[PDB]
Amino acid sequence: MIKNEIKILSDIEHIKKRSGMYIGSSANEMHERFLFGKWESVQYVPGLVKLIDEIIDNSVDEGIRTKFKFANKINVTIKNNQVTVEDNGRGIPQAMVKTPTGEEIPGPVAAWTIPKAGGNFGDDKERVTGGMNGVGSSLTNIFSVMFVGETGDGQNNIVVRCSNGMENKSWETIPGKWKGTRVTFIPDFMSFETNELSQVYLDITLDRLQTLAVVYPDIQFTFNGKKVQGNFKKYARQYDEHAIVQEQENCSIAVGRSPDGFRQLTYVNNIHTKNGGHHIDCVMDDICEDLIPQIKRKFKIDVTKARVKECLTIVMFVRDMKNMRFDSQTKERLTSPFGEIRSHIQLDAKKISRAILNNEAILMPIIEAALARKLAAEKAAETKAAKKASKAKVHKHIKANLCGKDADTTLFLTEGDSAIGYLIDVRDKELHGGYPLRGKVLNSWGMSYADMLKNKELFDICAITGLVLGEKAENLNYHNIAIMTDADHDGLGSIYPSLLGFFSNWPELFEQGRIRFVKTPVIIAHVGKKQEWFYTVAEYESAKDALPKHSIRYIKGLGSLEKSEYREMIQNPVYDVVKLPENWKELFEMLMGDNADLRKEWMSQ
């Protein structure tokens, strides 16, 4: 039975038991992130990046609260699983703050050990800093095995040292003359689904310092002792080199191209709100409210707001926001009221609209892609037909009238158009269907399905019958198959084995016994008062000797014959039943194929 008891925890146990509430994701996961202007797939833990960004945003907010005179250099050094963030701010105060429990705890140690403490619990409408909750650097202290905070206000140095996952904590005061904050912490890896800080975390932190230096050029961010220059122009051309830019006193927006989905990046003050907010929705609404009637008058096309928006990458920057509200601790969605953001943001949407209208490299690709979609929609027009003949029929394909239904209908394969003009009278109208072919027949051994349906004639054979290249022959329009390749040696040794090797792609036609070859004489000789027939030349080469005086006729083809002998060979045929044996595959490989040393040893016998 499920136990039902109530545990009332402290702040520390509620944080450590419910970690995913307070650091975001505590699991290694994949995302698609803009790194250095590139939409690259990353795989990382957002919790440790969030822990770095808490101290980073604390140092930046120390920058804003002194109006960028202090905390104007921020050193974020990440090496050997150790983050050292040092700024030259005025200092976390040494003055006496009081707990509600009655314990008298000094300033930086109450800021850095217990949560729900900080200097952002005052008025919200004048607070322009990215911090609200008062739990952040204490959350950095909680998920770190080692955490030292060295604070100088100019008169004293307060060292707050915590260890064993803040279970050991001690504050100490030295007389000194430094003025700034140094947070040096080594993260805990027992709760996170990682063990070390890899290069993707340092790349995310360096790209964040680059974006913050773009937003705040006065604060000199350094990573591992290397300076970072932030300009909106080079950052905007890192995304797309044709991005239209527009900078304001608080906003800075760049519009580019998104060919493989939708891309975005937005910053409210110093916060990376990667999941959005009301601000990007209001800015795209104000942009599309000018652009959509403009593209309607320009190119007369009905393209929606989302279809315009999804091809754009928008890199917009919001500075000095007031009363910022966020739906989570990680602050990834600005859920301030739309009147507040609409009053604060003074972005000129019509200038961006005319600037992307006058550009031919962003809007005109949306126009040509949309008319490509509409032309592909217009080209797909089909209807029905009254008793379609042999499904996809052919110009030279005569058809049996009971073909396709339940019957024993036979399809005819010849190579001559002269050898079918006699057929339509001498055949049955219901069971006999004739079709010639152009020239000889492709060597089709071991080669791809696409390269065999590139032939008009081979997909045409597939279109007459029920033959599909990748599956079995079950429902066939002509039940039987009767092939008449030409009677000469080129007509039996080049087109006929290539044809039956093509029919070897479905090795059940031979098994059903329906493969019939119709014999055709190549020598017809008048001897006595009668005509003797010879299917092969070697039949005559055996039987030339023991015959009397005669008048020969070599038979070039069935078109060289007359309608009477045509009627004889159709209405009384000779059906060679070609049966596939066991090892047909190696025999076809040694005949129809690239290697011919097999043909070398095979001719030699």
Ligand X SMILES: Nc1ncnc2c1ncn2[C@@H]1O[C@H](COP(=O)(O)OP(=O)(O)NP(=O)(O)O)[C@@H](O)[C@H]1O
Partner DNA sequence: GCATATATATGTATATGTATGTGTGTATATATACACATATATATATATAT
Partner DNA sequence: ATATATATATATATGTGTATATATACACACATACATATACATATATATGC
* Interaction site with ligand X (CB under 6 A): 54-55, 58-59, 61-62, 85, 89, 92, 111, 117-120, 131-138, 181, 183
486 marked as part of a ligand binding site:
yes
In the complex, least distance from residue 108 CB atom to ligand X, rounded to whole angstroms = 7
In the complex, least distance from residue 446 CB atom to DNA, rounded to whole angstroms = 11
Tokens of 450: 């696409």
289 marked as part of a ligand binding site:
no
Is the Cβ of residue 4 or residue 80 nearer to DNA in the bound state? 80
Is the Cβ of residue 137 or residue 336 nearer to ligand X in the bound state? 137
Helix (H, G, I), strand (E, B) or coil at 201: helix
Question: Which amino acid, one-letter code, is at 413?
Answer: L
In the complex, least distance from residue 87 CB atom to ligand X, rounded to whole angstroms = 6
5 vs 121: CA distance, rounded Å: 34
Question: Which amino acid, one-letter code, is at 304?
Answer: T
Is the Cβ of residue 75 or residue 443 nearer to ligand X in the bound state? 75
Residue pair 364/371 in contact by the 8 Å Cβ criterion: no
Instruction: Name the β-bridge partners of 150.
Output: 159, 182
Question: Which amino acid, one-letter code, is at 100?
Answer: P
11 marked as part of a ligand binding site:
no
In the complex, least distance from residue 182 CB atom to ligand X, rounded to whole angstroms = 8
594 makes contact, choosing from ligand X, DNA, none, with CB < 5 to 8 Å by partner type, with DNA
In the complex, least distance from residue 435 CB atom to DNA, rounded to whole angstroms = 13
Instruction: Name the β-bridge partners of 246.
Output: 253
In the complex, least distance from residue 309 CB atom to ligand X, rounded to whole angstroms = 31
Site for DNA, rule CB under 7 A: 415-417, 438-440, 442-443, 454-455, 486, 490, 494, 498, 557, 591-594, 596-597, 599-600
434 makes contact, choosing from DNA, ligand X, none, with CB < 5 to 8 Å by partner type, with none
- CA–CA distances in Å: residue 208 to residues 34, 234, 262, 307, 597: 10, 15, 21, 30, 66
134 makes contact, choosing from DNA, ligand X, none, with CB < 5 to 8 Å by partner type, with ligand X
Is the Cβ of residue 58 or residue 477 nearer to ligand X in the bound state? 58
64 vs 74: CA distance, rounded Å: 13
Is the Cβ of residue 376 or residue 603 nearer to DNA in the bound state? 603
Is the Cβ of residue 324 or residue 423 nearer to ligand X in the bound state? 324
DSSP tag of 188: -
35 makes contact, choosing from ligand X, DNA, none, with CB < 5 to 8 Å by partner type, with none
111 makes contact, choosing from ligand X, DNA, none, with CB < 5 to 8 Å by partner type, with ligand X
DSSP string for residues in 78-135: E-SS-EEEEE--S-S--S-EE-TTS-EE-HHHHHHSSSS-SS--S-SSS--SS--SS-
488 marked as part of a ligand binding site:
yes
Instruction: Give the Cα-Cα-Cα angle 45, 47, 50 (nearest 5 degrees).
Output: 115
240 makes contact, choosing from ligand X, DNA, none, with CB < 5 to 8 Å by partner type, with none
Using alpha carbons, select from 214, 48, 235 the residue that is nearest to residue 144.
48
Is the Cβ of residue 451 or residue 541 nearer to DNA in the bound state? 451
Alpha carbon dihedral 354, 359, 363, 364, in 10-degree steps, equals 130
Residue pair 581/511 in contact by the 8 Å Cβ criterion: no
Q: Which residues are annotated as a binding site for Mg(2+)?
A: 54, 57, 486, 488
Q: Which residues are annotated as a binding site?
A: 54, 57, 486, 488
